[PDB]
Amino acid sequence: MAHSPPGHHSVTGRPSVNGLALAEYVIYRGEQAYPEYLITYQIMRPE
Amino acid sequence: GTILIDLSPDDKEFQSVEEEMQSTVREHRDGGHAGGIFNRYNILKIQKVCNKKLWERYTHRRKEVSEENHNHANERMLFHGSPFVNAIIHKGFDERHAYIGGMFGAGIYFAENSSKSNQYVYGIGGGTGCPVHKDRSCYICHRQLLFCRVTLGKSFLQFSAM
Ligand SMILES: O=c1[nH]c(-c2ccc(C(F)(F)F)cc2)nc2c(O)cccc12
Ligand SMILES: [Zn+2]
Secondary structure (H helix, E strand, O other), rough: OOOOOOOOOOEEEEEEEOOOOOOOOOOOHHHHHHEEEEEEEEEEEOO | OOEEEEOOOOOOHHHHHHHHHHHOOOOOOOOOOOOOOOOOOEEEEEEEEHHHHHHHHHHHHHHHHHHOOOOOEEEEEEEEEOOHHHHHHHHHHHHOOEOOOOOOOOOOEEEOOOHHHHHHOOOOOHHOOOOOOOOOOOOOOOOOEEEEEEEOEEEEEEEOOO
């Protein structure tokens, strides 16, 4: 697993082309995330 | 020592998490290739994940990050889709759960868009879709996502052509 940028604890990937896309985030230590909710779902066929 | 507690649909916590799921679906530039074609979900269940040890591991790291970032954890709630979701809830995140070939290097990736994380439920690029039908756009099989508490600390801002 890669290392966070010097002095930083994560990367924020901000889409610059698509204006409706929200951000993505990368951490490099598993201890920086806690899986608080488990969601079971189906995607729905559009009408 | 993980337990999963069901949230009632009548509970405001359930409803808050459902709205976060539903309100952050968007269209993807692959036309649905990886994650399927949909504008919304049928939410079947939402469970709270409780693990005392994993939680303590998390708050210990958060305190170190927070102090290194001048008293600011920069904590978010973000989605995670993975083929390892069943391992993650029991053992926590680690290097086995990283996206080696990710845009911003080998680490663990999270999304504000629920539908971005849904693209990884069945693997990178959606893999070969559901086990039963080999369908990345299967409308029958049940999927799972995680909605997670994430410590960002000082985050490096990378603009990205995506
Ligand atoms: O939720 C995500 N999971 C993943 C993901 C990517 C890969 C794996 C793997 F390799 F373990 F099967 C698991 C999860 N990638 C994301 C991304 O590249 C951007 C935004 C969100 C995610
Ligand atoms: Zn299926």
